[PDB]
mmCIF file with all atom_site columns, C-alpha atoms in Angstrom:
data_model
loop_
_atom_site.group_PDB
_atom_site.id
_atom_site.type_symbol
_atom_site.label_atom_id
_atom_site.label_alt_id
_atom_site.label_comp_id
_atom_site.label_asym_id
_atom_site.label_entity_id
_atom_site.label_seq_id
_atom_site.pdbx_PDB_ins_code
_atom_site.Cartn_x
_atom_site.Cartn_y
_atom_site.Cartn_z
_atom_site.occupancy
_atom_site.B_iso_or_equiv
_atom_site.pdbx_formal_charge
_atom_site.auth_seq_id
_atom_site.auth_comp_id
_atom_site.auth_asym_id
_atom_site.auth_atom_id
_atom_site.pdbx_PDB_model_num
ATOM 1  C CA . UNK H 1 1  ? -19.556 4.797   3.406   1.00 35.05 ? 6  UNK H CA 1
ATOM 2  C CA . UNK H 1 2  ? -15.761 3.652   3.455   1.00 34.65 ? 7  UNK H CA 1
ATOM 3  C CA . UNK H 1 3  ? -13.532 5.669   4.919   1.00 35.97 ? 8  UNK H CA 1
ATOM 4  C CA . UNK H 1 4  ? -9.576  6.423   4.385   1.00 35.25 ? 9  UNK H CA 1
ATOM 5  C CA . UNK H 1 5  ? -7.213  5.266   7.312   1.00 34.26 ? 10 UNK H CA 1
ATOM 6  C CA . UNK H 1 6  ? -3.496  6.037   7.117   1.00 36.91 ? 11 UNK H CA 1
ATOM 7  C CA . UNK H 1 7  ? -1.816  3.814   9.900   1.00 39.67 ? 12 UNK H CA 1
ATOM 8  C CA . UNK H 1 8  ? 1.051   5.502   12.078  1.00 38.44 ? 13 UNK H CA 1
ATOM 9  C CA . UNK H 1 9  ? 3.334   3.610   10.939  1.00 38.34 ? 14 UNK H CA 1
ATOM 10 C CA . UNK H 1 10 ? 2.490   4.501   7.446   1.00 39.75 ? 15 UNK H CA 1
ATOM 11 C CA . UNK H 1 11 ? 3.386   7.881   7.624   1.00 40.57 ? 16 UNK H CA 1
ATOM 12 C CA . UNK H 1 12 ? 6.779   6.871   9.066   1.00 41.64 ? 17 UNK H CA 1
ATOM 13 C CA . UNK H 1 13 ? 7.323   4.294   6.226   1.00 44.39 ? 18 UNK H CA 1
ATOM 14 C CA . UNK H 1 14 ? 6.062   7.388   3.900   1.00 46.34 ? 19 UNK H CA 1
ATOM 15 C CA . UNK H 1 15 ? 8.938   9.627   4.934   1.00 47.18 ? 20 UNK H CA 1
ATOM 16 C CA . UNK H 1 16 ? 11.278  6.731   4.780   1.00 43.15 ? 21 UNK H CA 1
ATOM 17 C CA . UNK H 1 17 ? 10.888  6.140   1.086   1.00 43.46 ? 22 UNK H CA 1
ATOM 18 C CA . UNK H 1 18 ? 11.340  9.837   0.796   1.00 42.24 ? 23 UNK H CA 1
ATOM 19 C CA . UNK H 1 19 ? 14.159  10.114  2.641   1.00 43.24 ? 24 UNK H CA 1
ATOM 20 C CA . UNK H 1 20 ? 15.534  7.016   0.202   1.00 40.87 ? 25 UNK H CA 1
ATOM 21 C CA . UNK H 1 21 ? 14.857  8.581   -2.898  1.00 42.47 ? 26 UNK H CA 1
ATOM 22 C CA . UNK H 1 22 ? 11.942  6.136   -4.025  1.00 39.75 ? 27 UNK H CA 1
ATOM 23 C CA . UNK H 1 23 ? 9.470   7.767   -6.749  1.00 41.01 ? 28 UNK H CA 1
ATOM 24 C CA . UNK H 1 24 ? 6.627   8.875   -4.546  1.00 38.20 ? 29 UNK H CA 1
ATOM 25 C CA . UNK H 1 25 ? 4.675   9.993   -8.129  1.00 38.80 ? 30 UNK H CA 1
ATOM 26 C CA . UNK H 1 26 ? 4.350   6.039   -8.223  1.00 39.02 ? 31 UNK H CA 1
ATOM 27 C CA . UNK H 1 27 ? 3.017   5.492   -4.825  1.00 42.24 ? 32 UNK H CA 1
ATOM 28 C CA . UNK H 1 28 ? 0.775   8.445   -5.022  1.00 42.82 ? 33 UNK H CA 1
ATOM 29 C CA . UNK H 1 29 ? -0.869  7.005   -8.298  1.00 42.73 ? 34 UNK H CA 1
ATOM 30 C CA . UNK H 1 30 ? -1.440  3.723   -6.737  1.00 44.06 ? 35 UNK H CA 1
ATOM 31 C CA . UNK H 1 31 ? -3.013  4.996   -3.298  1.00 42.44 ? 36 UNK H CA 1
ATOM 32 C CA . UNK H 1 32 ? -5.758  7.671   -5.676  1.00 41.67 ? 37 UNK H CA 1
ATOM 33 C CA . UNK H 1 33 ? -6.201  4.432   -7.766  1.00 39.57 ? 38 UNK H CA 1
ATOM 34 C CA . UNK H 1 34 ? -7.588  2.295   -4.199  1.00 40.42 ? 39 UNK H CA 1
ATOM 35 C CA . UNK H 1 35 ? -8.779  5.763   -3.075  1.00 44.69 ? 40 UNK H CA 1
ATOM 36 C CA . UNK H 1 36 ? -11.610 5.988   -5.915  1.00 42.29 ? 41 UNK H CA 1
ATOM 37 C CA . UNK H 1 37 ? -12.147 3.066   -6.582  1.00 43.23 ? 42 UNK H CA 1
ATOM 38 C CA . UNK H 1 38 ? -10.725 0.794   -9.092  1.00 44.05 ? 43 UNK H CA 1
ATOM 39 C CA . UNK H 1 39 ? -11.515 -2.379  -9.797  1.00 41.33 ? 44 UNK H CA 1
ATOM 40 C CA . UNK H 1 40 ? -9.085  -4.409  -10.303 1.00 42.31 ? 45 UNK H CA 1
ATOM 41 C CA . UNK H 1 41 ? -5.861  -2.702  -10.477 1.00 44.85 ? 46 UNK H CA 1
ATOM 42 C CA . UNK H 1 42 ? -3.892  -3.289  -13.524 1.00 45.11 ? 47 UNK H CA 1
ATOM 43 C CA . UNK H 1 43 ? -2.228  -6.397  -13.786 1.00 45.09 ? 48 UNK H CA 1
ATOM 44 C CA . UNK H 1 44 ? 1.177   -5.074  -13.117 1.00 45.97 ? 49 UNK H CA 1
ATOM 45 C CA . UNK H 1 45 ? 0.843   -3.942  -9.855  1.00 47.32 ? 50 UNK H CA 1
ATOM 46 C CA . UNK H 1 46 ? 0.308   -7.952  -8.960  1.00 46.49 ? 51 UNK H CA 1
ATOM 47 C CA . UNK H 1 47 ? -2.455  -6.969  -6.495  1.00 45.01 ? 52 UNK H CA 1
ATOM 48 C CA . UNK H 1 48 ? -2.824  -10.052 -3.898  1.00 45.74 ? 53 UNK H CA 1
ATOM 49 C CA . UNK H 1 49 ? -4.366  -10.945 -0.367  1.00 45.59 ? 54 UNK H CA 1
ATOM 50 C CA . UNK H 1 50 ? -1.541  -11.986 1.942   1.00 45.39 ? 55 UNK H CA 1
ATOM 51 C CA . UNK H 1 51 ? -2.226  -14.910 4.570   1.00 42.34 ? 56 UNK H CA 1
ATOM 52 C CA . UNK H 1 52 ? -0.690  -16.131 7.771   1.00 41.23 ? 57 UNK H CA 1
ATOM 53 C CA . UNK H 1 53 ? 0.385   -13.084 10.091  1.00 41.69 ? 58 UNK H CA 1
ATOM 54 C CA . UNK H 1 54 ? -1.201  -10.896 7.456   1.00 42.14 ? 59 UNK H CA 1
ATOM 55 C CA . UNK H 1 55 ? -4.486  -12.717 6.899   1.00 41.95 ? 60 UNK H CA 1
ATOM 56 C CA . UNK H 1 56 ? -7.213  -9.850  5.712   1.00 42.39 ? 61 UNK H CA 1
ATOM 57 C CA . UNK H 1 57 ? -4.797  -7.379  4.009   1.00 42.22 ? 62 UNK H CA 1
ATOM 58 C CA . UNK H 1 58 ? -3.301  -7.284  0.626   1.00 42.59 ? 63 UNK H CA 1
ATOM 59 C CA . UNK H 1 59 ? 0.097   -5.992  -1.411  1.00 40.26 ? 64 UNK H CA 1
ATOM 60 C CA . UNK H 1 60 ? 0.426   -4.351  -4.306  1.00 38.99 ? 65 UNK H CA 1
ATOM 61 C CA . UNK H 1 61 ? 4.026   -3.795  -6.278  1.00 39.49 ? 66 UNK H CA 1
ATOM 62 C CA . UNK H 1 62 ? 4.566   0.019   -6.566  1.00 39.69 ? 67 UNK H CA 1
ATOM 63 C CA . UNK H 1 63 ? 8.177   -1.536  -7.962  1.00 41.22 ? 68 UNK H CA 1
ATOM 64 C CA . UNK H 1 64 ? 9.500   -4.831  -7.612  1.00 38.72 ? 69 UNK H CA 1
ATOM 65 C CA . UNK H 1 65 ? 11.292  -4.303  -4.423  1.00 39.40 ? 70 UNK H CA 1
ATOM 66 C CA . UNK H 1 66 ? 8.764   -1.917  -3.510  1.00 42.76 ? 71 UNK H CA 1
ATOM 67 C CA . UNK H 1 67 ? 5.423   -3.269  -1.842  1.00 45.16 ? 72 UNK H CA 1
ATOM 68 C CA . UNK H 1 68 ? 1.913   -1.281  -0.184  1.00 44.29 ? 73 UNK H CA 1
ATOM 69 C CA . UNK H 1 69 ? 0.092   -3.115  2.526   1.00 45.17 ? 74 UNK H CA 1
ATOM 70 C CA . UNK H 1 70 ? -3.425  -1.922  2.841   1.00 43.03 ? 75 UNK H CA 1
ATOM 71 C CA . UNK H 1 71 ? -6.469  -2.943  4.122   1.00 43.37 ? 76 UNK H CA 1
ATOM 72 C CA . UNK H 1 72 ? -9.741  -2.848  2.048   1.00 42.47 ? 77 UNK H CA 1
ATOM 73 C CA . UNK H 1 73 ? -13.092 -3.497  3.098   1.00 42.02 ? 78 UNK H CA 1
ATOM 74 C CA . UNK H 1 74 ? -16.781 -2.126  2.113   1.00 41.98 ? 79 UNK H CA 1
ATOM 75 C CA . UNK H 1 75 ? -15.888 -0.149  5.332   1.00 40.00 ? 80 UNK H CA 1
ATOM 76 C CA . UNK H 1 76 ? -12.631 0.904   4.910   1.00 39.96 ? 81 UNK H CA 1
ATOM 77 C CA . UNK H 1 77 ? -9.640  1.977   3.019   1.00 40.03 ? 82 UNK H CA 1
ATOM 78 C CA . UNK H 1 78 ? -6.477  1.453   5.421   1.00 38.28 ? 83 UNK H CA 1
ATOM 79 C CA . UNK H 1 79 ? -2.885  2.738   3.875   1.00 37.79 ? 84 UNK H CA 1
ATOM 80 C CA . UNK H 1 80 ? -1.252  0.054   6.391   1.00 37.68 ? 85 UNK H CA 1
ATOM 81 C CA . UNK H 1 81 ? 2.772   -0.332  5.589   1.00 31.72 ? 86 UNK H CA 1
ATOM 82 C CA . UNK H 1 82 ? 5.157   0.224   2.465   1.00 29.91 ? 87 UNK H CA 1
ATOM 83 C CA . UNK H 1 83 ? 8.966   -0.168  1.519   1.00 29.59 ? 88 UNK H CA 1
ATOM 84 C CA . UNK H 1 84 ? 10.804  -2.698  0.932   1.00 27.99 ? 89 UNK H CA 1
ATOM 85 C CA . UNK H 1 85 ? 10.195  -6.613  0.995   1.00 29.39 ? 90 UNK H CA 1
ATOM 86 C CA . UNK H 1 86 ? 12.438  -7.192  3.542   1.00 29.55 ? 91 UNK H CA 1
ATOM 87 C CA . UNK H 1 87 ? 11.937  -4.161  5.711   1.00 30.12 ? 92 UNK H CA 1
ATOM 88 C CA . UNK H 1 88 ? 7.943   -5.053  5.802   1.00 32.54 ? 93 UNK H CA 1
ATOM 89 C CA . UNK H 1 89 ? 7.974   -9.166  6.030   1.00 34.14 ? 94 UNK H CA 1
ATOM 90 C CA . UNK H 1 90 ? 11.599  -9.840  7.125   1.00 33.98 ? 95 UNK H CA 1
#
C-alpha cells in the first residue's frame, strides 16, 4: 500500500505560495489527481522525471512558472517541493 508523504519543506513552500497569492485551487487539483491515482496526468501539466541532483523525482507545471516536485513510487506518494523555477532549481 502507498502511502502520502508531505516533506517539511513542503509545507513551508505551501504557505509561501499562499502568502504570494498563487491559486492554491490549482495545486490542490493536481496533488488529489497523484493522490488517487491518475494515470498519466493530462498533457498540460508536462509531467516529467528530472535527472542529475534530482534523479528519481518528477515535476509537474501547476502554471508555467509554477512547478511540484514529488516523489512517486509503488510505495509512496511524496509532496517534495513547489514554487517557482528559480526558487526550486536555481
Amino acid at each position: 500500500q502507498r502511502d502520502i508523504e508531505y516533506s517539511g519543506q513542503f509545507s513551508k513552500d505551501v504557505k509561501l505560495a499562499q502568502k504570494r497569492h498563487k491559486d492554491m485551487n490549482k495545486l490542490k487539483y493536481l496533488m488529489t489527481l497523484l493522490i488517487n491515482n491518475t494515470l498519466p496526468l493530462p498533457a498540460v501539466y508536462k509531467d516529467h522525471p528530472l535527472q542529475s541532483s534530482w534523479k528519481g523525482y518528477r515535476d509537474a507545471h501547476v502554471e508555467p512558472d509554477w512547478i511540484l516536485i514529488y516523489k512517486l513510487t509503488d510505495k509512496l506518494l511524496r509532496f517534495e517541493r513547489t514554487g517557482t523555477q528559480a526558487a526550486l532549481f536555481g
